[PDB]
Design a protein around this ligand. Sequence first.
Ligand SMILES: CNC(=O)c1cc(C(=O)N[C@H]2CC[C@H](O)CC2)n([C@@H](C)c2ccccc2)n1
Length: 110
Amino acid sequence: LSEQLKHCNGILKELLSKKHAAYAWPFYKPVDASALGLHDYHDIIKHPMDLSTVKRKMENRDYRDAQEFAADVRLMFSNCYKYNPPDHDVVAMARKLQDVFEFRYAKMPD
Ligand SMILES: CNC(=O)c1cc(C(=O)N[C@H]2CC[C@H](O)CC2)n([C@@H](C)c2ccccc2)n1
């Protein structure tokens, strides 16, 4: 449980690392709908999520288990797939970062 949350923290550090920055950068901070002119974003996305919020929740010991952590990371990707045209670069970037996430999450010590 501690060990599983350390694995989750390792994944989070990797998703925020320079290695993945080319496709991870749209997920670093909350979507600023107003700044991007996406005035329908908060009508379509009821539960915004981003890696800075995941990092705050990890630092605050909000996550009680790996499943709660994974739920937030996957919510972040789901929001991207729900809102954006499926042929837009941001969806390709989501797919690439979710591939990194899912393959390493699958190696959870258990
Ligand atoms: C998690 N972030 C997102 O969901 C998101 C959505 C967007 C965005 O601007 N989406 C538009 C693109 C034009 C289209 O006609 C409507 C939707 N962006 C910006 C930062 C973006 C990311 C990647 C490359 C260009 C622009 N991040």
